[PDB]
């Protein structure tokens, strides 16, 4: 006579929280992070194409041919151009 | 595991039936699906939930389940229906998993200077040692190869 | 319909591990489970395991329990399969297939075209007889193929 | 992404946010 | 929740129901257990995956957008260019944060409605063959063995069959 | 729907109820027919017309906005001007699409709530003089001729009068 | 309202319940009166204060932003600068007005759900020891003195105790 059935819902030990306008820090069973905050700390090839690092020289020194930029005389193709605060 | 007959054959236009026999842990307490597999191609679902067909599977394919045995049926047999057929179901045996049947094939009616020396004996036009399994030529005669190291 | 596209073929040595992937069209989040099924030459398919949407839970067959790991990058619409301690017996065609709903089940309604994993003690070598991965041929006990 | 507004290639949209988590499941209440 | 079920008249959740979001816990002489409700969990997973894809598709990727250089005699257009860049970042940050805040509220209410819909479905099935004992449980007036329980969870409970068998 | 009525316990719609959005289908010895519920259809038409006007009024018309010309020595401000024009278009496109997506969801839930409100109104009227037979139908315990049916649809059903006349 | 309570089956409000948003009016031989329901009024005040703070925090303050001067030979960048300033104002005006319109609708529905939740809580308590007489009132089948009424409002009404004492 003690046969019973109950409706209910899932729970787990997730500790991730989400916000609403009505309430902050709501623990939910499942969620996705939509925000990337992690990088690798390097300048890389861009789809198999290496960038052009100008190093000691700036745009003017590269194209004009400053003696310090013989390393750049061989530049043909690149994916981006990088200057530094020391590119003088 | 699920047991099927290894091989069945029939003439075009006939109806064949492929039995899949398991235990109370698989077929006797869960749904049964069937897959058709053609050479070089992935398994193709024919029957799900014992007897339902997906979109695109013709009327002549059908399935059923009786207690512990499931059964695939094909009518109006065609040359294109000659393939391997597999049953599958959800086995609660040890850890639960998906289990396939064994399968049922349906048929429709200079060197000797390097201190080494190998033998060459070819064979074709028919119908320590390695042996080539009989492949299939474009001629449709069987061919192979064999070597004694 | 849905397209499942497995990554390229793999050839690996025993005891190493291989990580193949399966990229699904649309989405990128899916509401149905995806599992991996392999099939050795002259054999029936054998299920390996699957993964559930949102929940991320996995089930593995007892035979591969302990050395298979299924994971999902839902933002990239991709599912991965890593198999370790490779034996020669692991040489088979590997398929990803999707289920009709969110639970893994005997019913997989759409499959990828499959990719091959070959596990041999051999390494690649040029022919002189005695070459390895196929460019009918027969294989010696060396694992090397010799053709004519 | 919140790493940098200057980007080369195919990148995520830059925002100043520090958290952007989107609920997929329900309110988690394991012990009552 | 707006529908009074989650953290409402159903006081809490079930860590022991692992195969889905909403479902049942039964209890009869043969034993007890949990079981997810596949059909309703599936409908929710449809909508939530759709929701997440919708957010993704609305935020098209940012392509190459680099800065510019100005001389000491071009500070008005330098500051204008800075004003433009900052302005758009403030607006997409607002858009992103607001969308997630609002969608998070709706997602939780959505789950709450789904639980309430399920409870009322069962209530409508069992009618007065069982006693609504609050906390989301129904106490049967007849013996409900495993087949009986299985039919409740399939939605094909047989109210005439058991109305004559009450204890 | 969030309220369980539309595509819920009322399994489907009525192509034969042409004069409104929500209403009744009755069935007694004299005959059968449909009838829209004017008061509730009107309230919804009020709100939806208001909703559509609200969308209109928030999107003030675009007046004359033409492009500009730049020389081969003005590419920084040319690209800045392009950046500005493209940026605002991306933002109004997002605003427009998002508003319609969100309002569409709310509009459907709105209709679902209106149907549920109507059903519960009738249920509250008929009380236990009629049997809730699911699918949104009430089966009367007394003969309910056309005047009886008309009074249910007016909200002035007479529960005392018929409580003594049950079959 | 989406939940049928406010301006729904509870036809109107109470200027005489001054200590909260939702509550009770009782009536027995000893006397009558109003009493706010603290626990539910508190939960709503939590959420609404949170809502208002959320709006505040999303609208960061505007710092010094002055205009610029241009010559009669700089009208293209003058008009560009004007285009930028006007554009952003049109967008924050849209954002501000839309947020308040949408939040206002949700706030009202929120209150409507809270009233309905309270009514169903009491209904679930009293069960069939009282008659649901519509308009949100329960008429008791047993004498309910002040202690009895106080226990209903505390959620600890004793359905077994009074089920034997019905008039
Ligand atoms: C939410 O939790 C974080 C981390 O525990 C904390 O820094 C923050 O103050 C909390 N906010 C609220 C409103 O509880
Ligand atoms: C479960 O319900 C379906 C209808 O939705 C019905 O066809 C099926 O027979 C039911 N199963 C059992 C075991 O009664
Ligand atoms: C219909 O209801 C109104 C009150 O809303 C009442 O004044 C009117 O007399 C009713 N009509 C009939 C025919 O009872
Ligand atoms: C009111 O309810 C609380 C439980 O929420 C209980 O501890 C307390 O004793 C009750 N008060 C009375 C007077 O019964
Ligand atoms: Cl909730
Ligand atoms: Cl709907
Ligand atoms: Cl209201």
PDB file of N, CA, C and O in Angstrom, chain E residues 79-143:
ATOM      1  N   UNK E  79      42.235  60.845 -32.066  1.00  0.00           N
ATOM      2  CA  UNK E  79      41.245  60.676 -31.006  1.00  0.00           C
ATOM      3  C   UNK E  79      39.906  60.196 -31.554  1.00  0.00           C
ATOM      4  O   UNK E  79      39.217  59.407 -30.898  1.00  0.00           O
ATOM      5  N   UNK E  80      39.523  60.648 -32.751  1.00  0.00           N
ATOM      6  CA  UNK E  80      38.312  60.126 -33.378  1.00  0.00           C
ATOM      7  C   UNK E  80      38.421  58.618 -33.601  1.00  0.00           C
ATOM      8  O   UNK E  80      37.517  57.852 -33.235  1.00  0.00           O
ATOM      9  N   UNK E  81      39.538  58.173 -34.192  1.00  0.00           N
ATOM     10  CA  UNK E  81      39.763  56.744 -34.381  1.00  0.00           C
ATOM     11  C   UNK E  81      39.743  55.995 -33.051  1.00  0.00           C
ATOM     12  O   UNK E  81      39.209  54.882 -32.961  1.00  0.00           O
ATOM     13  N   UNK E  82      40.312  56.586 -32.002  1.00  0.00           N
ATOM     14  CA  UNK E  82      40.244  55.936 -30.700  1.00  0.00           C
ATOM     15  C   UNK E  82      38.804  55.890 -30.200  1.00  0.00           C
ATOM     16  O   UNK E  82      38.346  54.861 -29.688  1.00  0.00           O
ATOM     17  N   UNK E  83      38.071  56.992 -30.368  1.00  0.00           N
ATOM     18  CA  UNK E  83      36.672  57.030 -29.965  1.00  0.00           C
ATOM     19  C   UNK E  83      35.876  55.924 -30.648  1.00  0.00           C
ATOM     20  O   UNK E  83      35.060  55.248 -30.011  1.00  0.00           O
ATOM     21  N   UNK E  84      36.115  55.710 -31.943  1.00  0.00           N
ATOM     22  CA  UNK E  84      35.370  54.686 -32.671  1.00  0.00           C
ATOM     23  C   UNK E  84      35.695  53.299 -32.129  1.00  0.00           C
ATOM     24  O   UNK E  84      34.797  52.515 -31.812  1.00  0.00           O
ATOM     25  N   UNK E  85      36.986  52.971 -32.024  1.00  0.00           N
ATOM     26  CA  UNK E  85      37.381  51.645 -31.557  1.00  0.00           C
ATOM     27  C   UNK E  85      36.820  51.360 -30.165  1.00  0.00           C
ATOM     28  O   UNK E  85      36.183  50.324 -29.945  1.00  0.00           O
ATOM     29  N   UNK E  86      37.026  52.282 -29.213  1.00  0.00           N
ATOM     30  CA  UNK E  86      36.501  52.077 -27.861  1.00  0.00           C
ATOM     31  C   UNK E  86      34.985  51.943 -27.872  1.00  0.00           C
ATOM     32  O   UNK E  86      34.429  51.048 -27.223  1.00  0.00           O
ATOM     33  N   UNK E  87      34.298  52.813 -28.617  1.00  0.00           N
ATOM     34  CA  UNK E  87      32.844  52.784 -28.629  1.00  0.00           C
ATOM     35  C   UNK E  87      32.287  51.421 -28.991  1.00  0.00           C
ATOM     36  O   UNK E  87      31.459  50.864 -28.267  1.00  0.00           O
ATOM     37  N   UNK E  88      32.753  50.854 -30.111  1.00  0.00           N
ATOM     38  CA  UNK E  88      32.259  49.553 -30.554  1.00  0.00           C
ATOM     39  C   UNK E  88      32.570  48.448 -29.544  1.00  0.00           C
ATOM     40  O   UNK E  88      31.776  47.518 -29.376  1.00  0.00           O
ATOM     41  N   UNK E  89      33.718  48.519 -28.869  1.00  0.00           N
ATOM     42  CA  UNK E  89      34.034  47.510 -27.862  1.00  0.00           C
ATOM     43  C   UNK E  89      33.071  47.615 -26.692  1.00  0.00           C
ATOM     44  O   UNK E  89      32.613  46.602 -26.150  1.00  0.00           O
ATOM     45  N   UNK E  90      32.753  48.842 -26.274  1.00  0.00           N
ATOM     46  CA  UNK E  90      31.785  49.007 -25.203  1.00  0.00           C
ATOM     47  C   UNK E  90      30.430  48.444 -25.595  1.00  0.00           C
ATOM     48  O   UNK E  90      29.695  47.941 -24.741  1.00  0.00           O
ATOM     49  N   UNK E  91      30.101  48.475 -26.882  1.00  0.00           N
ATOM     50  CA  UNK E  91      28.777  48.051 -27.310  1.00  0.00           C
ATOM     51  C   UNK E  91      28.713  46.535 -27.451  1.00  0.00           C
ATOM     52  O   UNK E  91      27.728  45.904 -27.047  1.00  0.00           O
ATOM     53  N   UNK E  92      29.754  45.913 -27.995  1.00  0.00           N
ATOM     54  CA  UNK E  92      29.715  44.461 -28.075  1.00  0.00           C
ATOM     55  C   UNK E  92      29.871  43.821 -26.700  1.00  0.00           C
ATOM     56  O   UNK E  92      29.281  42.767 -26.440  1.00  0.00           O
ATOM     57  N   UNK E  93      30.616  44.456 -25.794  1.00  0.00           N
ATOM     58  CA  UNK E  93      30.687  43.955 -24.425  1.00  0.00           C
ATOM     59  C   UNK E  93      29.316  43.993 -23.753  1.00  0.00           C
ATOM     60  O   UNK E  93      28.898  43.021 -23.115  1.00  0.00           O
ATOM     61  N   UNK E  94      28.603  45.120 -23.885  1.00  0.00           N
ATOM     62  CA  UNK E  94      27.227  45.209 -23.399  1.00  0.00           C
ATOM     63  C   UNK E  94      26.344  44.145 -24.049  1.00  0.00           C
ATOM     64  O   UNK E  94      25.595  43.437 -23.364  1.00  0.00           O
ATOM     65  N   UNK E  95      26.406  44.024 -25.377  1.00  0.00           N
ATOM     66  CA  UNK E  95      25.570  43.042 -26.054  1.00  0.00           C
ATOM     67  C   UNK E  95      25.849  41.634 -25.546  1.00  0.00           C
ATOM     68  O   UNK E  95      24.922  40.867 -25.258  1.00  0.00           O
ATOM     69  N   UNK E  96      27.127  41.269 -25.453  1.00  0.00           N
ATOM     70  CA  UNK E  96      27.480  39.922 -25.031  1.00  0.00           C
ATOM     71  C   UNK E  96      26.997  39.650 -23.613  1.00  0.00           C
ATOM     72  O   UNK E  96      26.339  38.636 -23.349  1.00  0.00           O
ATOM     73  N   UNK E  97      27.308  40.551 -22.685  1.00  0.00           N
ATOM     74  CA  UNK E  97      26.965  40.308 -21.288  1.00  0.00           C
ATOM     75  C   UNK E  97      25.459  40.277 -21.088  1.00  0.00           C
ATOM     76  O   UNK E  97      24.940  39.440 -20.341  1.00  0.00           O
ATOM     77  N   UNK E  98      24.739  41.165 -21.763  1.00  0.00           N
ATOM     78  CA  UNK E  98      23.300  41.236 -21.568  1.00  0.00           C
ATOM     79  C   UNK E  98      22.609  39.986 -22.106  1.00  0.00           C
ATOM     80  O   UNK E  98      21.773  39.388 -21.421  1.00  0.00           O
ATOM     81  N   UNK E  99      22.966  39.566 -23.325  1.00  0.00           N
ATOM     82  CA  UNK E  99      22.400  38.352 -23.904  1.00  0.00           C
ATOM     83  C   UNK E  99      22.557  37.149 -22.975  1.00  0.00           C
ATOM     84  O   UNK E  99      21.606  36.386 -22.769  1.00  0.00           O
ATOM     85  N   UNK E 100      23.746  36.972 -22.390  1.00  0.00           N
ATOM     86  CA  UNK E 100      23.984  35.820 -21.525  1.00  0.00           C
ATOM     87  C   UNK E 100      23.188  35.935 -20.228  1.00  0.00           C
ATOM     88  O   UNK E 100      22.607  34.950 -19.759  1.00  0.00           O
ATOM     89  N   UNK E 101      23.129  37.130 -19.636  1.00  0.00           N
ATOM     90  CA  UNK E 101      22.290  37.331 -18.453  1.00  0.00           C
ATOM     91  C   UNK E 101      20.828  36.978 -18.730  1.00  0.00           C
ATOM     92  O   UNK E 101      20.189  36.263 -17.951  1.00  0.00           O
ATOM     93  N   UNK E 102      20.270  37.497 -19.830  1.00  0.00           N
ATOM     94  CA  UNK E 102      18.860  37.248 -20.108  1.00  0.00           C
ATOM     95  C   UNK E 102      18.619  35.794 -20.489  1.00  0.00           C
ATOM     96  O   UNK E 102      17.666  35.170 -20.002  1.00  0.00           O
ATOM     97  N   UNK E 103      19.480  35.223 -21.338  1.00  0.00           N
ATOM     98  CA  UNK E 103      19.291  33.828 -21.718  1.00  0.00           C
ATOM     99  C   UNK E 103      19.454  32.897 -20.528  1.00  0.00           C
ATOM    100  O   UNK E 103      18.771  31.869 -20.456  1.00  0.00           O
ATOM    101  N   UNK E 104      20.334  33.240 -19.579  1.00  0.00           N
ATOM    102  CA  UNK E 104      20.492  32.394 -18.398  1.00  0.00           C
ATOM    103  C   UNK E 104      19.207  32.341 -17.583  1.00  0.00           C
ATOM    104  O   UNK E 104      18.784  31.262 -17.151  1.00  0.00           O
ATOM    105  N   UNK E 105      18.566  33.494 -17.370  1.00  0.00           N
ATOM    106  CA  UNK E 105      17.284  33.508 -16.672  1.00  0.00           C
ATOM    107  C   UNK E 105      16.250  32.656 -17.405  1.00  0.00           C
ATOM    108  O   UNK E 105      15.573  31.823 -16.791  1.00  0.00           O
ATOM    109  N   UNK E 106      16.132  32.827 -18.725  1.00  0.00           N
ATOM    110  CA  UNK E 106      15.136  32.060 -19.467  1.00  0.00           C
ATOM    111  C   UNK E 106      15.444  30.568 -19.436  1.00  0.00           C
ATOM    112  O   UNK E 106      14.528  29.747 -19.310  1.00  0.00           O
ATOM    113  N   UNK E 107      16.726  30.196 -19.529  1.00  0.00           N
ATOM    114  CA  UNK E 107      17.093  28.783 -19.489  1.00  0.00           C
ATOM    115  C   UNK E 107      16.634  28.129 -18.186  1.00  0.00           C
ATOM    116  O   UNK E 107      16.059  27.038 -18.207  1.00  0.00           O
ATOM    117  N   UNK E 108      16.850  28.790 -17.044  1.00  0.00           N
ATOM    118  CA  UNK E 108      16.443  28.215 -15.764  1.00  0.00           C
ATOM    119  C   UNK E 108      14.923  28.086 -15.668  1.00  0.00           C
ATOM    120  O   UNK E 108      14.403  27.040 -15.267  1.00  0.00           O
ATOM    121  N   UNK E 109      14.195  29.145 -16.019  1.00  0.00           N
ATOM    122  CA  UNK E 109      12.737  29.060 -16.062  1.00  0.00           C
ATOM    123  C   UNK E 109      12.269  27.957 -17.003  1.00  0.00           C
ATOM    124  O   UNK E 109      11.263  27.286 -16.736  1.00  0.00           O
ATOM    125  N   UNK E 110      12.985  27.765 -18.113  1.00  0.00           N
ATOM    126  CA  UNK E 110      12.636  26.723 -19.073  1.00  0.00           C
ATOM    127  C   UNK E 110      12.657  25.353 -18.409  1.00  0.00           C
ATOM    128  O   UNK E 110      11.669  24.608 -18.455  1.00  0.00           O
ATOM    129  N   UNK E 111      13.767  25.024 -17.741  1.00  0.00           N
ATOM    130  CA  UNK E 111      13.853  23.773 -16.996  1.00  0.00           C
ATOM    131  C   UNK E 111      12.738  23.659 -15.954  1.00  0.00           C
ATOM    132  O   UNK E 111      12.171  22.577 -15.755  1.00  0.00           O
ATOM    133  N   UNK E 112      12.413  24.764 -15.277  1.00  0.00           N
ATOM    134  CA  UNK E 112      11.376  24.737 -14.249  1.00  0.00           C
ATOM    135  C   UNK E 112      10.023  24.370 -14.857  1.00  0.00           C
ATOM    136  O   UNK E 112       9.297  23.526 -14.315  1.00  0.00           O
ATOM    137  N   UNK E 113       9.691  24.962 -16.011  1.00  0.00           N
ATOM    138  CA  UNK E 113       8.459  24.623 -16.722  1.00  0.00           C
ATOM    139  C   UNK E 113       8.438  23.163 -17.163  1.00  0.00           C
ATOM    140  O   UNK E 113       7.384  22.504 -17.126  1.00  0.00           O
ATOM    141  N   UNK E 114       9.584  22.647 -17.614  1.00  0.00           N
ATOM    142  CA  UNK E 114       9.622  21.265 -18.074  1.00  0.00           C
ATOM    143  C   UNK E 114       9.313  20.288 -16.942  1.00  0.00           C
ATOM    144  O   UNK E 114       8.559  19.324 -17.137  1.00  0.00           O
ATOM    145  N   UNK E 115       9.859  20.533 -15.747  1.00  0.00           N
ATOM    146  CA  UNK E 115       9.535  19.686 -14.603  1.00  0.00           C
ATOM    147  C   UNK E 115       8.048  19.779 -14.272  1.00  0.00           C
ATOM    148  O   UNK E 115       7.380  18.758 -14.066  1.00  0.00           O
ATOM    149  N   UNK E 116       7.501  21.001 -14.231  1.00  0.00           N
ATOM    150  CA  UNK E 116       6.084  21.144 -13.911  1.00  0.00           C
ATOM    151  C   UNK E 116       5.203  20.460 -14.956  1.00  0.00           C
ATOM    152  O   UNK E 116       4.197  19.825 -14.609  1.00  0.00           O
ATOM    153  N   UNK E 117       5.558  20.584 -16.242  1.00  0.00           N
ATOM    154  CA  UNK E 117       4.796  19.897 -17.280  1.00  0.00           C
ATOM    155  C   UNK E 117       4.783  18.392 -17.038  1.00  0.00           C
ATOM    156  O   UNK E 117       3.736  17.738 -17.159  1.00  0.00           O
ATOM    157  N   UNK E 118       5.936  17.824 -16.669  1.00  0.00           N
ATOM    158  CA  UNK E 118       6.012  16.386 -16.441  1.00  0.00           C
ATOM    159  C   UNK E 118       5.130  15.969 -15.270  1.00  0.00           C
ATOM    160  O   UNK E 118       4.344  15.022 -15.379  1.00  0.00           O
ATOM    161  N   UNK E 119       5.225  16.687 -14.152  1.00  0.00           N
ATOM    162  CA  UNK E 119       4.420  16.364 -12.977  1.00  0.00           C
ATOM    163  C   UNK E 119       2.929  16.391 -13.298  1.00  0.00           C
ATOM    164  O   UNK E 119       2.181  15.486 -12.900  1.00  0.00           O
ATOM    165  N   UNK E 120       2.474  17.420 -14.017  1.00  0.00           N
ATOM    166  CA  UNK E 120       1.052  17.500 -14.333  1.00  0.00           C
ATOM    167  C   UNK E 120       0.624  16.409 -15.306  1.00  0.00           C
ATOM    168  O   UNK E 120      -0.522  15.947 -15.247  1.00  0.00           O
ATOM    169  N   UNK E 121       1.518  15.996 -16.211  1.00  0.00           N
ATOM    170  CA  UNK E 121       1.217  14.873 -17.091  1.00  0.00           C
ATOM    171  C   UNK E 121       0.907  13.625 -16.279  1.00  0.00           C
ATOM    172  O   UNK E 121      -0.110  12.958 -16.498  1.00  0.00           O
ATOM    173  N   UNK E 122       1.772  13.301 -15.321  1.00  0.00           N
ATOM    174  CA  UNK E 122       1.531  12.130 -14.494  1.00  0.00           C
ATOM    175  C   UNK E 122       0.256  12.315 -13.686  1.00  0.00           C
ATOM    176  O   UNK E 122      -0.578  11.409 -13.601  1.00  0.00           O
ATOM    177  N   UNK E 123       0.071  13.497 -13.100  1.00  0.00           N
ATOM    178  CA  UNK E 123      -1.132  13.728 -12.310  1.00  0.00           C
ATOM    179  C   UNK E 123      -2.374  13.483 -13.142  1.00  0.00           C
ATOM    180  O   UNK E 123      -3.312  12.817 -12.692  1.00  0.00           O
ATOM    181  N   UNK E 124      -2.374  13.992 -14.374  1.00  0.00           N
ATOM    182  CA  UNK E 124      -3.496  13.806 -15.284  1.00  0.00           C
ATOM    183  C   UNK E 124      -3.704  12.336 -15.618  1.00  0.00           C
ATOM    184  O   UNK E 124      -4.839  11.902 -15.834  1.00  0.00           O
ATOM    185  N   UNK E 125      -2.626  11.559 -15.655  1.00  0.00           N
ATOM    186  CA  UNK E 125      -2.732  10.124 -15.880  1.00  0.00           C
ATOM    187  C   UNK E 125      -3.349   9.424 -14.684  1.00  0.00           C
ATOM    188  O   UNK E 125      -4.356   8.721 -14.810  1.00  0.00           O
ATOM    189  N   UNK E 126      -2.735   9.578 -13.513  1.00  0.00           N
ATOM    190  CA  UNK E 126      -3.147   8.778 -12.371  1.00  0.00           C
ATOM    191  C   UNK E 126      -4.521   9.165 -11.863  1.00  0.00           C
ATOM    192  O   UNK E 126      -5.185   8.326 -11.248  1.00  0.00           O
ATOM    193  N   UNK E 127      -4.959  10.404 -12.110  1.00  0.00           N
ATOM    194  CA  UNK E 127      -6.264  10.919 -11.656  1.00  0.00           C
ATOM    195  C   UNK E 127      -6.390  10.602 -10.165  1.00  0.00           C
ATOM    196  O   UNK E 127      -5.442  10.862  -9.409  1.00  0.00           O
ATOM    197  N   UNK E 128      -7.503  10.025  -9.708  1.00  0.00           N
ATOM    198  CA  UNK E 128      -7.736   9.770  -8.292  1.00  0.00           C
ATOM    199  C   UNK E 128      -7.460   8.318  -7.897  1.00  0.00           C
ATOM    200  O   UNK E 128      -7.938   7.863  -6.851  1.00  0.00           O
ATOM    201  N   UNK E 129      -6.712   7.583  -8.718  1.00  0.00           N
ATOM    202  CA  UNK E 129      -6.184   6.282  -8.329  1.00  0.00           C
ATOM    203  C   UNK E 129      -4.958   6.395  -7.443  1.00  0.00           C
ATOM    204  O   UNK E 129      -4.412   5.365  -7.037  1.00  0.00           O
ATOM    205  N   UNK E 130      -4.503   7.615  -7.161  1.00  0.00           N
ATOM    206  CA  UNK E 130      -3.325   7.840  -6.339  1.00  0.00           C
ATOM    207  C   UNK E 130      -3.491   9.159  -5.603  1.00  0.00           C
ATOM    208  O   UNK E 130      -4.214  10.052  -6.047  1.00  0.00           O
ATOM    209  N   UNK E 131      -2.798   9.277  -4.477  1.00  0.00           N
ATOM    210  CA  UNK E 131      -2.912  10.433  -3.597  1.00  0.00           C
ATOM    211  C   UNK E 131      -1.713  11.354  -3.804  1.00  0.00           C
ATOM    212  O   UNK E 131      -0.565  10.923  -3.668  1.00  0.00           O
ATOM    213  N   UNK E 132      -1.987  12.605  -4.166  1.00  0.00           N
ATOM    214  CA  UNK E 132      -0.958  13.634  -4.295  1.00  0.00           C
ATOM    215  C   UNK E 132      -0.420  13.966  -2.914  1.00  0.00           C
ATOM    216  O   UNK E 132      -1.096  14.644  -2.136  1.00  0.00           O
ATOM    217  N   UNK E 133       0.783  13.514  -2.588  1.00  0.00           N
ATOM    218  CA  UNK E 133       1.282  13.676  -1.230  1.00  0.00           C
ATOM    219  C   UNK E 133       2.288  14.821  -1.132  1.00  0.00           C
ATOM    220  O   UNK E 133       3.106  14.837  -0.215  1.00  0.00           O
ATOM    221  N   UNK E 134       2.226  15.788  -2.052  1.00  0.00           N
ATOM    222  CA  UNK E 134       3.225  16.839  -2.141  1.00  0.00           C
ATOM    223  C   UNK E 134       4.656  16.359  -2.377  1.00  0.00           C
ATOM    224  O   UNK E 134       4.926  15.150  -2.461  1.00  0.00           O
ATOM    225  N   UNK E 135       5.588  17.301  -2.480  1.00  0.00           N
ATOM    226  CA  UNK E 135       6.982  17.022  -2.840  1.00  0.00           C
ATOM    227  C   UNK E 135       7.095  16.301  -4.177  1.00  0.00           C
ATOM    228  O   UNK E 135       8.160  15.780  -4.524  1.00  0.00           O
ATOM    229  N   UNK E 136       6.014  16.266  -4.950  1.00  0.00           N
ATOM    230  CA  UNK E 136       6.066  15.673  -6.269  1.00  0.00           C
ATOM    231  C   UNK E 136       5.847  14.183  -6.317  1.00  0.00           C
ATOM    232  O   UNK E 136       6.104  13.573  -7.359  1.00  0.00           O
ATOM    233  N   UNK E 137       5.366  13.579  -5.235  1.00  0.00           N
ATOM    234  CA  UNK E 137       5.167  12.142  -5.156  1.00  0.00           C
ATOM    235  C   UNK E 137       3.685  11.792  -5.187  1.00  0.00           C
ATOM    236  O   UNK E 137       2.844  12.512  -4.638  1.00  0.00           O
ATOM    237  N   UNK E 138       3.377  10.672  -5.839  1.00  0.00           N
ATOM    238  CA  UNK E 138       2.036  10.096  -5.861  1.00  0.00           C
ATOM    239  C   UNK E 138       2.047   8.761  -5.139  1.00  0.00           C
ATOM    240  O   UNK E 138       2.844   7.881  -5.475  1.00  0.00           O
ATOM    241  N   UNK E 139       1.161   8.601  -4.166  1.00  0.00           N
ATOM    242  CA  UNK E 139       1.045   7.357  -3.413  1.00  0.00           C
ATOM    243  C   UNK E 139      -0.150   6.562  -3.937  1.00  0.00           C
ATOM    244  O   UNK E 139      -1.284   7.050  -3.896  1.00  0.00           O
ATOM    245  N   UNK E 140       0.103   5.356  -4.450  1.00  0.00           N
ATOM    246  CA  UNK E 140      -0.932   4.595  -5.148  1.00  0.00           C
ATOM    247  C   UNK E 140      -1.926   3.967  -4.176  1.00  0.00           C
ATOM    248  O   UNK E 140      -1.564   3.544  -3.075  1.00  0.00           O
ATOM    249  N   UNK E 141      -3.186   3.900  -4.601  1.00  0.00           N
ATOM    250  CA  UNK E 141      -4.258   3.226  -3.876  1.00  0.00           C
ATOM    251  C   UNK E 141      -4.381   1.754  -4.247  1.00  0.00           C
ATOM    252  O   UNK E 141      -5.150   1.027  -3.609  1.00  0.00           O
ATOM    253  N   UNK E 142      -3.662   1.315  -5.271  1.00  0.00           N
ATOM    254  CA  UNK E 142      -3.635  -0.067  -5.710  1.00  0.00           C
ATOM    255  C   UNK E 142      -2.180  -0.519  -5.748  1.00  0.00           C
ATOM    256  O   UNK E 142      -1.261   0.306  -5.787  1.00  0.00           O
ATOM    257  N   UNK E 143      -1.964  -1.833  -5.717  1.00  0.00           N
ATOM    258  CA  UNK E 143      -0.606  -2.327  -5.895  1.00  0.00           C
ATOM    259  C   UNK E 143      -0.133  -1.990  -7.304  1.00  0.00           C
ATOM    260  O   UNK E 143      -0.823  -2.275  -8.288  1.00  0.00           O
TER     261      UNK E 143
END
